[PDB]
RNA sequence: CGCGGGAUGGAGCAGGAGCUCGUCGGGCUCAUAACCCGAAGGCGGUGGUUCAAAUCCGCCUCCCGCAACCA
RNA sequence: UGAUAUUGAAAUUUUCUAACCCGCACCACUUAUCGUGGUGGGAGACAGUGUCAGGCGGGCAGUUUGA
RNA sequence: UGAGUAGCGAAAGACGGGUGAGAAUCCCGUCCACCGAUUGACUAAGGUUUCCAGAGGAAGGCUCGUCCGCUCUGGGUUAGUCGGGUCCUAAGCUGAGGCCGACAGGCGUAGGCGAUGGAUAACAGGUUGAUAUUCCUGUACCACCUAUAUGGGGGGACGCAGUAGGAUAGGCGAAGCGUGCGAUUGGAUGCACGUCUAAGCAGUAAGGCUGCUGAGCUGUGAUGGGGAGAAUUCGAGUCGUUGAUUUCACACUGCCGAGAAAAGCCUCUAUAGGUGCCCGUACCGCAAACCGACACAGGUAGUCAAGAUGAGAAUUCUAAGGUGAGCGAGCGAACUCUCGUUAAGGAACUCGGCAAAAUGACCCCGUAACUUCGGGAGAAGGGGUGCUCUUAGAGCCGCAGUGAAUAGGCCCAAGCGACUGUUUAUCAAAAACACAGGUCUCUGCUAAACCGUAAGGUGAUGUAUAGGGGCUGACGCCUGCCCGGUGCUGGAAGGUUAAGAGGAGUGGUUGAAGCUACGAAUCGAAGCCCCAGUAAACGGCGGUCCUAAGGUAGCGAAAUUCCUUGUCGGGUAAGUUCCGACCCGCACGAAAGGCGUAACGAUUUGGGCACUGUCUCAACGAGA
RNA sequence: CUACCCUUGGUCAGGUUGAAGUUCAGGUAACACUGAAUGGAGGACCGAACCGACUUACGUUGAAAAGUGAGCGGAUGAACU
RNA sequence: AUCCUGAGUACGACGGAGCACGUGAAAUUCCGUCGGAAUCUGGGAGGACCAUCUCCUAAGGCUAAAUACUCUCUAGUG
RNA sequence: GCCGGACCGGCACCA
């Protein structure tokens, strides 16, 4: 059966990547939250 | 003329089509073509704002000269051609300086005819003139609403208007809908009636042909749910069940007039269409 | 099975008893009908409230309307 | 839908132009269907917009709908 | 605990030899078996070292393990030409100025980014444990470098179907050549394979179009290579037939639904030497490495496409190649599952013929009611297929000849829906939705409608033969009455009302004025009250009385009928279902359409034939 | 993932039926009309790939959190990808 | 007190808001719309408002400290 | 309750 996750390097980077997060105010809020929590990984 | 298909299949039963006899050239003028991607009833936000639009055959736009603002130069009708973007056929005309333009093809126009535009042009089918120089009683089409803007009225297949009178700086015209209204006398119109008169006689015949034309199915409100439509819900089939039939957005949709008041054309419209 | 409404000259309707048709007598007509003129004739019942009851109290004998279910 | 502000000028609703408006034409910025200016044309103290007011308003909302 | 219980995830293995502490499970060999429009081969995504060699056996592997996609150590991916960038644009995204918006921000012009498309120069052979159009060999091509010698136009550039051809690839046959082999089972002297070689460069060329184009062929490339082969040297590349799904080529014809852009490119205003970057390249890849928690019977785009049989990429057996499936050994109980057969009967089973049986290919006869004249139709129902010989006959054999496998069951009647299509991913595929067609209504264009606070948009680069919304739902015949109520449309300014205008007048305070709190006539819109019209608007179509008016046509115990298994007829031996009638319509009825309707249906319902383990009534056999 | 849409690509073994036109022949005053051949239309027919999911059996601490076996619907289109 | 001393301001009407205070007899402060003063013989406030008295002098600006907090640093505490 | 006609018709209605 076809499952929900169909990985795609380009789609992953374009939707969840660092530059996409930077492009919006709320995305920069995401990055700030992860930096505050101390995450090793900030984005895709 | 109209050709009626034999009932070889249930789909072909009662189906009719135009024979396209009046079409002389089956290919368009390359230099007058522009791309025309489909919007499918979706606006700049990406949201669907007009229902029942989508799909359909790919089309290329033909640049049409609605303005007819090339005066004093005779143009010869090169061909009559199919236009997927409008009900009327179009005419490829070649001016004496070699420039080629597309015009709405009027009824009775033929290959080799000479057309012209301007105040001094003769009253003949295909000639474009200001409404000030068109005699009363003349059948016209492609009528401007503002000088130099280009024809906006009576462009559909078989559409025409009759010049009724000349009052001051305005000309009284009767439109296809029956409404009689004033139009600035410096506005231009083309002599004659738009061709392709049998366009309206076509029996589409099957659902697929509408799909080719790009029309997606219409779902009746009464077979929806209450959260979708005021006509939704009810056990089994249901009548309207409210004082007036409703649009999907909760507005009365049978007889309720929607033309706004305080329009500048209120003083220009003499008789309503009804 | 629960709730409610009705019983008016002979007929259909009004409602502390009148309109129309029906009957009788006379007239008009060759005769009948139609028509015209006069006369008579009535609160479904059973008990009570009431100075006094078609009228109000409850019930009785039928008809009529809504409803008689969630399993 | 009315008042009032933007909002002016003359007759007695009509007129005018100059504010305001034009998903109107031409020109320039400019290899530009945006915009901004310029000129014409249309319209015009109306419209639009602000404030106040009356009306409509299951289109949408918060709730009530006893024992 | 359940319990040494369930399970150990589709299937064919056997033996010999080896290794080893230990072997059904690892390696080698022989035989056997399975796939083969694929279990074969090659691209892409995705994964990211899983790739290779040596070593190892704790844990992982549903058993075992000496083995591994596991552990340890060391390795492996080579490009001017392949794919991408240093080229082009599509949707879309972004956007200098700009427009809009409490903020945050939204939009948008020029421009820019952006392949799934356009442009663009390299082939063949060899080689490793692991890379190869990348390394090597031979032979090329492209861009640039050095020396000798900006506007116009065109083009790119395009759909779908079908047909007739040319060529080539590929298949087949003869063996023309070549290479082998030549048989201890009765016989013969026949048996089995091979039969090629690119880009580039010159010559040419079937065609096609109105000179331009054009598949392909020939030579060269190539005393090179590769080769069925013999013991490093030597070795054949020929005749016929068939023939593409490839290519000429979206060339030609036809059709309506009318089929990108931009750049590269075109056109008008030699030789010689040298240089040539970055990213990817391992491996898996219809899967044990991807998505499914798994070494999971699932899902995963494209390409290549052999023989016999055949219409076929169907069927069965095979080729190339790959595989024997990560628990086994016995036994051959019940019971369960998957298969095969079955006396006599043949739907008696059951809610219901559910399931199964039956039909089935090709060729020839032959084919009804009804019909929208197309259909219905493969209607139905019947005949023939083997092999040998002669040139349609004569023979031969079997129980049986499309001898296997694969390949419609059919008929009669009724409800519903015209039809193909769509739907509740995961209990409903339908009579529901859609539909072509009909009608009503809105909308004169900065249209109406819709999204958005707006700007900006969709509608539409459309313009009443157009666009939006409501209802109905092919087609045929048709669609009756009611405008009193509600809605909608149009009148009227008579009454009623708000802000605002207006100030009669009254009080507080100081005889006042002043300040102050109120404040009455009168004016002041839409709406409403009123009138009219409108039913394919919402609705309504009763009980002499009343109403706005009391059901026309057609249909009717119906997908509607409660009584009810109404009554009568047909069908059965027997029929609460079915069909045909009646009308007493609890409680049909004309676009929430009425009545019919050929064709269509994995629709619902009744009957019949064929057929059968559905059943009387079970029995035996195969496998898990 | 799924619904719908936008741009740009790709795919559909084989059989069957035989629409419109055209030509020839009859026929006419001229048309209508007719037969034969040609032609190859269709949300056409049968049926693989492919897309579905009607029935049934199995599975129901599954091989699988929706599957498998056998039949079944569509299969040039409102097709699938 | 001859001159100057903050004008679309103060203030008012309407609609709101902030004031403990829900429009209330609601003073006092602010916003939008519209109107709109006076000038030391002036102007504002003392909880509607008037008068008297009392206090003050809006419509310009600047101004440490006592106050709030702890991701930190230094030294310590329970 | 406020008002216009002959109760009717609009408006008003926060113990
Ligand atoms: K990759
Ligand atoms: K046993
Ligand atoms: K319409
Ligand atoms: K009405
Ligand atoms: K597509
Ligand atoms: K106030
Ligand atoms: Mg629509
Ligand atoms: Mg529904
Ligand atoms: Mg609703
Ligand atoms: Mg309803
Ligand atoms: Mg109902
Ligand atoms: Mg509600
Ligand atoms: Mg609450
Ligand atoms: Mg209770
Ligand atoms: Mg235990
Ligand atoms: Mg045991
Ligand atoms: Mg046990
Ligand atoms: Mg056991
Ligand atoms: Mg077991
Ligand atoms: Mg296994
Ligand atoms: Mg494979
Ligand atoms: Mg390995
Ligand atoms: Mg183990
Ligand atoms: Mg390893
Ligand atoms: Mg933008
Ligand atoms: Mg390799
Ligand atoms: Mg590789
Ligand atoms: Mg993994
Ligand atoms: Mg798997
Ligand atoms: Mg799979
Ligand atoms: Mg697939
Ligand atoms: Mg096969
Ligand atoms: Mg395994
Ligand atoms: Mg038997
Ligand atoms: Mg037998
Ligand atoms: Mg039998
Ligand atoms: Mg039986
Ligand atoms: Mg029985
Ligand atoms: Mg069956
Ligand atoms: Mg067969
Ligand atoms: Mg259907
Ligand atoms: Mg269907
Ligand atoms: Mg379901
Ligand atoms: Mg289902
Ligand atoms: Mg319907
Ligand atoms: Mg009326
Ligand atoms: Mg009427
Ligand atoms: Mg009943
Ligand atoms: Mg009905
Ligand atoms: Mg009707
Ligand atoms: Mg109706
Ligand atoms: Mg119907
Ligand atoms: Mg059967
Ligand atoms: Mg067994
Ligand atoms: Mg293929
Ligand atoms: Mg079909
Ligand atoms: Mg089929
Ligand atoms: Mg589905
Ligand atoms: Mg299946
Ligand atoms: Mg079928
Ligand atoms: Mg004050
Ligand atoms: Mg001051």
Author numbering:
A (entry chain 2): 2 to 45
B (entry chain C): 2 to 275
Quoted from the paper:
In Staphylococcus aureus, an opportunistic pathogen, macrolide resistance is primarily mediated by Erm-family methyltransferases, which mono- or dimethylate A2058 in the 23S ribosomal RNA, reducing drug binding. Using cryo-electron microscopy, we determined the high-resolution structures of solithromycin-bound ribosomes, including those with dimethylated A2058. Our focus is on solithromycin (SOL), a bactericidal fourth-generation macrolide, because of its enhanced ribosomal binding properties. Our study demonstrates that SOL can bind to the ribosome both in unmodified and in double-methylated states.
The unmodified, macrolide-sensitive SA ribosome purified from strain KES34 and complexed with solithromycin (SA_KES34_SOL) before vitrification was imaged on a Titan Krios using a Gatan K3 camera with an energy filter. After data processing in RELION, which included CTF refinement (accounting for high-order aberrations, anisotropic magnification estimation, and defocus fitting) and Bayesian per-particle polishing, we obtained a 2.15 Å cryo-EM reconstruction of the 70S ribosome (resolution values throughout calculated on the postprocessed, masked maps using the gold-standard FSC 0.143 threshold). To improve resolution and to aid in modeling, we performed a multibody refinement focused on the large ribosomal subunit and the small subunit (head and body), which yielded a 2.07 Å map for the 50S subunit, and 2.38 Å maps for both the small subunit head and the body. Remarkably, the cryo-EM map revealed additional densities corresponding to P-site and E-site tRNAs, along with fragments of an A-site tRNA and mRNA. Although tRNA molecules and mRNA nucleotides were not intentionally assembled into the complex, their high-quality density allowed us to model these molecules, thereby underscoring the functional integrity of the purified ribosomes. Within the nascent peptide exit tunnel (NPET), solithromycin is clearly resolved, binding through key interactions with conserved rRNA residues across bacterial species. Similar to other macrolides, the desosamine group of the antibiotic establishes water-mediated H-bonds with the N6 of A2058 and with the phosphate group of G2505, and a direct H-bond with the N2 of A2058. In addition, the alkyl–aryl side chain of SOL appears to have stacking interactions with the rRNA base pair U2609:A752. The high resolution achieved, in addition, allowed us to model several rRNA modifications, including m7G2574 (G2601 in S. aureus numbering) in helix H90 of the 23S rRNA, which was previously reported on S. aureus, and to identify specific Zn binding isoforms of ribosomal proteins (including bL32, eL33 type 1, eL36). Our study shows that the interactions of SOL in the S. aureus ribosome align closely with the previously published structures of the E. coli ribosomes, validating the common nature of the SOL binding mode in bacteria.
